[PDB]
Amino acid sequence: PKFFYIKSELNGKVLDIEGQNPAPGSKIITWDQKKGPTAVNQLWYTDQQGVIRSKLNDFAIDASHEQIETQPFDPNNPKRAWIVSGNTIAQLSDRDIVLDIIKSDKEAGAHICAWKQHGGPNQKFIIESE
Numbered sequence: 234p235k236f237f238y239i240k241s242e243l244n245g246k247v248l249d250i251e252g253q254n255p256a257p258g259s260k261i262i263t264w265d266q267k268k269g270p271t272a273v274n275q276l277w278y279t280d281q282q283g284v285i286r287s288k289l290n291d292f293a294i295d296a297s298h299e300q301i302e303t304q305p306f307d308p309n310n311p312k313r314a315w316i317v318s319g320n321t322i323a324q325l326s327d328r329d330i331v332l333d334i335i336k337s338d339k340e341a342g343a344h345i346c347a348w349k350q351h352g353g354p355n356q357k358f359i360i361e362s363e
């Protein structure tokens with residue numbers, strides 16, 4: 234489909250599958266934006282259900298643990314269905330739960346959690362076409 238970056242309003246860094254790792258359970262972190270073929274682990278698309286998937290391996294965003302990680306999409310696991318909702322990345326079944334850069338950590342490599350929406354910039358994202 235059409236690919237995009239999910240770019241933090243906090244620091245302009247983008248969501249990134251850490252180390253371009255194709256394995257389940259790879260952490261999704263913030264990282265400086267890359268362009269070209271190597272950017273595949275920073276590129277995302279929405280499936281037929283509007284659910285976000287990685288260009289790398291078609292994995293979903295998973296929020297089953299304290300930090301977010303990649304997992305194969307399963308439509309029966311509510312914590313693997315994340316959608317674009319304005320400038321937030323929201324849980325399909327609960328739009329008030331959103332992706333959140335933990336403790337507003339501005340450094341590269343920062344981890345992301347699911348948290349209730351509170352309007353802080355650490356929960357705000359710009360969708361940028363590839």
Ligand SMILES: CC(=O)N[C@@H]1[C@@H](O)[C@@H](O)[C@@H](CO)O[C@H]1O
Pocket residue numbers: 249250251252253264271274342
């Ligand atoms: C091309 C590539 O692999 N780059 C990744 C980078 O995107 C980021 O995930 C970083 C985290 O330390 O690891 C690097 O290996």
Ligand SMILES: CC(=O)N[C@@H]1[C@@H](O)[C@@H](O)[C@@H](CO)O[C@H]1O
Pocket residue numbers: 333334335336337346348351353355
């Ligand atoms: C208002 C605010 O930014 N609160 C943050 C929250 O968004 C989340 O990142 C959490 C991680 O434990 O840390 C809190 O300090």
